[PDB]
Design a protein around this ligand. Structure first.
Ligand SMILES: O=c1cc(-c2ccccc2)oc2c(O)c(O)ccc12
Ligand SMILES: O=c1cc(-c2ccccc2)oc2c(O)c(O)ccc12
Ligand SMILES: [Cl-]
Ligand SMILES: [Cl-]
Ligand SMILES: [Mg+2]
Ligand SMILES: [Mg+2]
Lengths: 294, 294
């Protein structure tokens, strides 16, 4: 079982050598804000040269795929294909396309708590949004899902409207992620989607379907068109309750990096409490410590 | 132990006859919106004539005491003294006066998520509010508590600011109540303070101190200046998880009325699960069914 071992030396060479691919979280792992983790671009170059696949899995719902790719490029992570990038915005759009109830003759609409990047991803997946223009003089379509994402314009009015839609038990409640907060460059924090989802769940008396990590649905989304063997894939992240739990649920070897949110002391506390699904198999100070294993 | 018995006949005469006073919740008990429960004003008149004390305990944080009294009067509940009326706004103001940390030479300030009635109650208790005018050219005072109440102007910006203040571990987090939602006359619902508190707690990683029912603090507040013997007091409410739990925690005989939020089926389910602190001792269809016992 996971023992939170510092990955180095011969063990590092064996773990990386056997791996066919690596799944990376982005924030806290590849970069912090507009600052790349030193050595992280070189790791990705070396992984590609070694024939090992790299995929990127982020709970960040702020950017549609084209703008998500831009952040990678300007921080040194070159040569990446858009098909390597998975966000909770992209995967929530796909889940809604797959699960929106209602008849095919009258597609439902999605009431979105979130920003323009998320809305763009939803429309690109063919979804119609509450508040988009209605057809001719016709009435507004029936709202068949509420989607909670990262919404810097969240308000009591929007919360009340979400509850009005959720009065219909057949209306879905979906959240992009349950991350409670995020650290910012200046040392402050911003509320996360999990805090907004908590309000919607509490006021509506519903439980949300969560798209992003640690939900296994995120793994279905990334593998819909890419064959990855979880027994041969490393999951690298900075958050115990999202990245590491995700890896355990999917059968992946997990690596905690310490350049982000979770601390080594927290991982060791979970291990002492016996909560092994929150314990990384391995940790590194930063992902630059993985490059020597190639 | 509580068995959720319909209170009537000789048992009703014995329960009411032995009681020295009755504590009533307001919404769902005395009235629904601007409609008094028929027979409720007459019950209060008869209780007073019988020499039994009546007190009113509400989690509603929207009205300061003077405006709270107005609703009673226009719905038929005459002859009431302001000292009989206790709200979570009044009791949160008193708790903050009693517990605000910091030195006496520099009083702290309270950052309030809530409306003008709540703010008025706080100022009347001597508290200074974040955003009130600063003295001369001096800087803004240190925020030493965040108070979450019913805030129809809640926003992401206000949530983020609350978290900035709560970064200081010595800053208190207080909530007026944890009621998750409330029913409206038209059949819709409005989000409750509990939904906003859930967001603040989740984004800040804190647990709030809750003033209102079912917290025992509400009982300390009402009895600070009124001697009531809980063994001789009936607690009458419409919500299992707030009024009935409150009564059990305080040692009062509890009566569920069915003119509000909780349903008889829910009470019976708690009893079958053995969750006796959520089980009323007695229930009535409406509080008008209590009058015959006098
Ligand atoms: O710098 C960061 C920014 C963010 C962020 C996510 C959504 C909206 C706004 C900001 O999230 C982070 C994160 O979750 C980490 O694990 C580590 C770092 C960050
Ligand atoms: O008609 C009602 C209105 C409200 C209300 C409380 C705070 C803000 C806005 C509305 O709360 C209720 C309640 O909690 C009940 O138990 C029963 C009825 C009501
Ligand atoms: Cl929308
Ligand atoms: Cl304030
Ligand atoms: Mg991260
Ligand atoms: Mg009530």
């Amino acid at each position: 079982m996971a023992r939170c071992e510092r990955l180095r030396g011969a063990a590092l060479r064996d773990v990386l050598g056997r791996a066919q691919g690596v799944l990376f979280d982005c924030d806290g792992v590849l970069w912090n804000g507009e600052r790349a983790v030193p050595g992280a671009p070189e790791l990705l170059e070396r992984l590609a040269r070694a024939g090992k696949a790299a995929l990127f899995v982020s709970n960040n719902s702020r950017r549609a795929r084209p703008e998500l790719a831009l952040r990678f490029a300007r921080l040194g992570f070159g040569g990446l294909r858009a098909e390597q990038l998975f966000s909770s915005a992209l995967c929530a759009a796909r889940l809604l396309r797959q699960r929106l109830p209602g008849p095919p003759d009258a597609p439902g609409a999605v009431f979105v708590l979130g920003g323009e990047g998320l809305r763009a991803e939803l429309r690109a997946a063919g979804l119609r949004l509450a508040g988009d223009p209605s057809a001719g003089d016709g009435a507004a379509p029936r709202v068949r899902a509420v989607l909670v994402g990262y919404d810097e314009h969240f308000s009591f009015a929007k919360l009340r409207e979400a509850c009005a839609h959720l009065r219909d038990p057949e209306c879905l409640l979906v959240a992009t992620d349950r991350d409670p907060w995020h650290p910012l460059s200046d040392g402050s924090r911003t509320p996360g989607t999990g805090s907004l989802a908590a309000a919607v769940e509490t006021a509506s008396g519903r439980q949300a379907l969560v798209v992003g990590k640690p939900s296994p649905y995120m793994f279905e989304c990334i593998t819909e068109n890419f064959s990855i063997d979880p027994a041969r894939t490393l999951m690298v992240g900075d958050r115990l309750e999202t990245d590491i739990l995700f890896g355990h649920r999917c059968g992946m070897t997990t690596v905690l990096t310490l350049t982000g949110v979770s601390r080594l002391e927290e991982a060791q506390a979970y291990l002492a409490a016996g909560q092994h699904d929150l314990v990384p198999h391995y940790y590194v100070e930063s992902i630059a410590d993985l490059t020597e294993g190639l």
